[PDB]
Amino acid sequence: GELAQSIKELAKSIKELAWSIKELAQSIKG
Amino acid sequence: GELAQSIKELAKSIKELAWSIKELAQSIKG
Amino acid sequence: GELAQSIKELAKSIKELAWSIKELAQSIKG
Amino acid sequence: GELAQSIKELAKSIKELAWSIKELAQSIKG
Amino acid sequence: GELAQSIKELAKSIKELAWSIKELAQSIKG
Amino acid sequence: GELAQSIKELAKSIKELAWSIKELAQSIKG
């Protein structure tokens, strides 16, 4: 149901956060 | 129920954080 | 119940910290 | 149950991450 | 079922976020 | 069975997340 649906949305948001953190790590090196 | 609603709010707030981290990275780069 | 209320409060804090990070990124740019 | 308690623990860690990113941005702004 | 499947993807996304944060920490320390 | 193993993988990923955020704080402060 909607519990599982909401957890899939949360997982997708966490993947987007992990990508932004990789971008920040690269920008710190220049 | 309200648990599923709170998880969806958390997912939207994490997406907001990911976008702000992407902007921070570009500012350090430029 | 209690756990869903807590998750919603934490989501709001994360959202507000995201807004603050974006403001800092904006002034690092100039 | 345990599922909601784990989501709450995750949200606490994400909030702590956002505070660390803010302090990183502040140190770079100087 | 769907609930187990959604929690799998959630756990794997959190593992990827943890790895990205370690990469950030190492970039910051230099 | 499969849901039970979901939960346990989620719990381990959240401990790894917590450890990585401690590393991030130490690198910022150093």
Numbering used by the authors:
A (entry chain D), B (entry chain E), C (entry chain F), D (entry chain A), E (entry chain C), F (entry chain B): 1 to 30
Quote the study's own text:
CCs are quaternary structures comprising two or more α-helices supercoiled around each other with cyclic (Cn) or dihedral (Dn) symmetry. Here, we describe variants with all combinations of the aliphatic residues, Ile, Leu and Val, at a and d to give four classes of peptide: the ββ class, with a and d = Ile or Val; Lβ, a = Leu and d = Ile or Val; βL, a = Ile or Val and d = Leu; and LL, a = d = Leu. Peptides are named systematically appending the one-letter code for the amino acids at the a and d sites to “CC-Type2-“; e.g., CC-Hept becomes CC-Type2-LI. In summary, solution-phase data and X-ray crystal structures demonstrate conclusively that different classes of Type-2 coiled-coil (CC) peptides—i.e., based on abcdefg repeats with predominantly hydrophobic residues at a, d, e and g—adopt a range of distinct states.
Not all of the peptides with e = g = Ala were soluble, therefore, some were made with g = Ser or Glu, and suffixes “-Sg” or “-Eg” are added to the systematic names. By contrast, those of the βL class and peptide CC-Type2-LL showed weak or non-specific binding of DPH. In addition, we found hitherto unreported plasticity in the βL class of structures: compared with CC-Type2-IL-Eg, CC-Type2-IL-Sg—which differ at peripheral g and c sites—is a fully collapsed CC structure above tetramer. The latter makes an incomplete slipped barrel of five helices with a sixth helix packed against these to fill the void completely and consolidate a hydrophobic core; i.e., screw symmetry is broken in this structure. The two collapsed structures were more complicated. Nonetheless, both had extensive KIH interfaces linking all helices and, as such, are CC-based structures. CC-Type2-IL-Sg only had identity symmetry element (E) due to a Type-3 interfaced helix docking into a slipped barrel architecture, Fig. 4a. Sequences with β-branched (Ile or Val) residues at both a and d or with Leu at a plus Ile at d (ββ and LI classes, respectively) form cyclically symmetric, blunt-ended structures with central channels, i.e., they are α-helical barrels. βL class peptides adopt slipped barrel-like or collapsed structures depending on the amino acid at g.
